[PDB]
Amino acid sequence: NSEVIKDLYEYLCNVRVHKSYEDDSGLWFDISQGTSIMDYKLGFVKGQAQVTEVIYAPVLKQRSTEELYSLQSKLPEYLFETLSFPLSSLNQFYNKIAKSLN
């Protein structure tokens, strides 16, 4: 019943979040954002200076040629490359993706 809550996030934020199927470290996440969809991964890297770094890796296979073509039009270039940023900038990054898709 934390599942009815999961469905609420999904309606509210237009994003599905799952633990990475291929990964087992508990650090990788499959993310599905869209209303016109963009799939990607988020990796969480800490240690070092003890501040969490977020890696973003775009996932393109589940895209038809037509979806892909649609995204190339409305998404900024950098969303098609692997990125790296502080956890604190993560929401703003989510916001970028949200606007780009709308």
Added chain:
Amino acid sequence: NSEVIKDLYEYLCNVRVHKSYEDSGLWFDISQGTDYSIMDYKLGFVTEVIYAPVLKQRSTEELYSLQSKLPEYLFETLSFPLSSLNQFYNKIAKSLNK
């Protein structure tokens, strides 16, 4: 596990669903935040959505601050279709991000 996903949602979307309780219907306690602004509200389900501001834990200082950037209607109880929940979350996010 689901606490991790929840943490993720909080960092990704700046929104936390504290709890859920059914009473009249299905209700959700929500916090949305970003100086930082926090707006508490409720989402009720009866499909339509009922939105009720929850201002009881704001200071007067915060109210004034929230008042200067939030559109009047976010201080009222509103009803609207599920098909528009997301844009609403979006309006709140935009308003708090000033």
